[PDB]
């Protein structure tokens, strides 16, 4: 590799310039036709919208400022926008516009019609190893990119991996993303995907993302996660147990990669070692993988979602559809001044 560190060097410059001086107020609410809710959440919803002058469809994420403040997610939200407007990568969902009004924060992202990986994974049951390795490869390249910018992602899961029309992954939800050099201590993520050091409140680094990758690869190939139960606590117990069992149909390579990733000891976890990401890229499981054709998206995807129109939502579950009011008074002005 030579044009890799060259790539990441130029990418750090592009990122840091946007990081230093983030864009703001690049649209407003009346420029969009609100059509349908693609996904719900704690802070508000994620609607499918059409840009009035462009005709393009986007996914507008709406955040109730008061709910953000109430859940003490102010800083996390400021992280998410600032990181999103600054990063740029083939497998990352792209932030077109950001703005705010008296009541809400808005993040307008390119629309990914293929739906969550979650939905296709659950319906199909499980992916064969070649299918799971096409996806895993995209995540490997994405974490390499992000970590080089000192960004930690902290919420990898099939629910946050969208599939585009060419069958590739777009990573979404940067709510827990954070630029950090060194350790951090926030308990956040999704139970089945929490690294042991997160649960044990030890303080952790970007190695929790590689653990999450192991969990992802396992779920994609097994059809279920390596640690599941009915209550998160019992999930944490299995995670900190350090004991994992693989399905009989798992290849010997796949098993070896996963024990390396689901390694409880940070001194023996893949991605957290001297050779960093290349320990993973040069694993036998990935011996078939052309990292360059993956990035360039020249491979052929093993699955391409049924397309049937620009504003189609057939790959998304239906949600109840709430009012959208804007208070006549400004809410939480000081807190979100930099958004």
């Amino acid at each position: 590799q030579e044009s890799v560190k060259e790539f990441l060097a130029k990418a750090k410059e592009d990122f840091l310039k946007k990081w230093e001086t983030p864009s703001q107020n690049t649209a407003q609410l009346d420029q969009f036709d609100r059509i349908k809710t693609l996904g719900t959440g704690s802070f508000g919803r994620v609607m499918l919208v059409k840009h009035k002058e462009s005709g393009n469809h986007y996914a507008m994420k709406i955040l109730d400022k008061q709910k953000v403040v109430k859940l003490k997610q102010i800083e996390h939200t400021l992280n998410e926008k600032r990181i999103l407007q600054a990063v740029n990568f083939p497998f990352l969902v792209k932030l077109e516009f950001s703005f705010k009004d008296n009541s809400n924060l808005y993040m307008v992202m390119e629309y990914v019609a293929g739906g969550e990986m979650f939905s296709h994974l659950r319906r199909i049951g499980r992916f064969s190893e070649p299918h799971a390795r096409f996806y895993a490869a995209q995540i490997v390249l994405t974490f390499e990119y992000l970590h080089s910018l000192d960004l930690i992602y902290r919420d990898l899961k099939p629910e946050n991996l969208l599939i585009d029309q060419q069958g590739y992954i777009q990573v979404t939800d940067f709510g827990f993303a954070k630029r950090v050099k060194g350790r951090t201590w926030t308990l956040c993520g999704t139970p089945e995907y929490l690294a042991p050091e997160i649960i044990l409140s030890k303080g952790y680094n970007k190695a929790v993302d590689w653990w999450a990758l192991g969990v992802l690869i396992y779920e994609m190939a097994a059809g279920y996660p390596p640690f599941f139960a009915d209550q998160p606590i019992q999930i944490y117990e299995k995670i900190v147990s350090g004991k994992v069992r693989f399905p009989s149909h798992f290849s010997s390579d796949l098993k070896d990669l996963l024990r390396n990733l689901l390694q409880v000891d940070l001194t023996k976890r893949f991605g957290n070692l001297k050779n960093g990401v290349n320990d993973i890229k040069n694993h036998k499981w990935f011996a078939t993988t052309d990292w360059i054709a993956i990035y360039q998206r020249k491979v052929e995807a093993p699955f391409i979602p049924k397309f049937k129109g620009p504003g189609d939502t057939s790959n998304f579950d239906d949600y109840e559809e709430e009012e959208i009011r804007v208070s006549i008074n400004e809410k939480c002005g000081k807190e979100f001044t930099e958004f």
Partner: peptide
Amino acid sequence: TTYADFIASGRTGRRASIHD
């Protein structure tokens, strides 16, 4: 089977993020 035990569990749906 593990699959059967999973499909019968309460966390087969979309899983919420957590923070505290």
